[PDB]
Amino acid sequence: NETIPRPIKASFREGLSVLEYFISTHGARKGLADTALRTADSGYLTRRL
DNA sequence: GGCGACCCGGCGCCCGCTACGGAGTCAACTACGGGTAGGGGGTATCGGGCAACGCGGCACTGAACACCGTTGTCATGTGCCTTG
């Protein structure tokens, strides 16, 4: 949960560079993990409710 | 000396189903004694295979009577002829 100083200046049509793709993957993997954990927590909440 | 944090234990859980891999593993010994269990051996008991022989309808046995039907049969009555 930090921010980079040099944000991605390229669109997916032009295509990201190497480091741009890497620093995007940094957030993509975290998003997938968050989705999994939120799904589990929502299921448990539904059961309790 | 009850409050107090803090500390610690101790516990409680941690979406849904299908469908989707195998793998399987390190250190005694003998003597006895019985008893059960197996085997064959022999034996009392139960189960399977055949013609008379139970029946029954009727059928024959007609035999021996019965049931009408029949032409046997008889002694006894009309009609004509002869004589009172």
**Angstrom distance, A26 CA to B42 C1':** 95
Give buried/exposed letters for A12-27 (b at 16+ CB in 10 A, else e). eeeebeeebeeeeeee
CB-CB contact of A10 with A21 (8 Å) = no
Q: Which nucleotides of B are covered by protein (CB under 7 A)?
A: 13-16
**Angstrom distance, A27 CA to B42 C1':** 96
CB-CB contact of A8 with A24 (8 Å) = yes
SS3 of A31-47? HHHHHHHHHHHHHHHHH
CB-CB contact of A16 with A24 (8 Å) = yes
| CB atoms inside a 10 Å sphere around CB A32 | 10
Nearest nucleotide to A47 by CA–C1' distance? B15
To one decimal, the resolution in angstroms is 3.5
* Angle (nearest 5°) at CA A17 between A12 and A20: 85
What length does chain A have? 49
Give how far the C-alpha of residue A20 lies from the chain's centroid of Cα atoms, to the nearest Å. Answer: 14
Distance, CA of A39 to CA of A45 (rounded, Å):
10
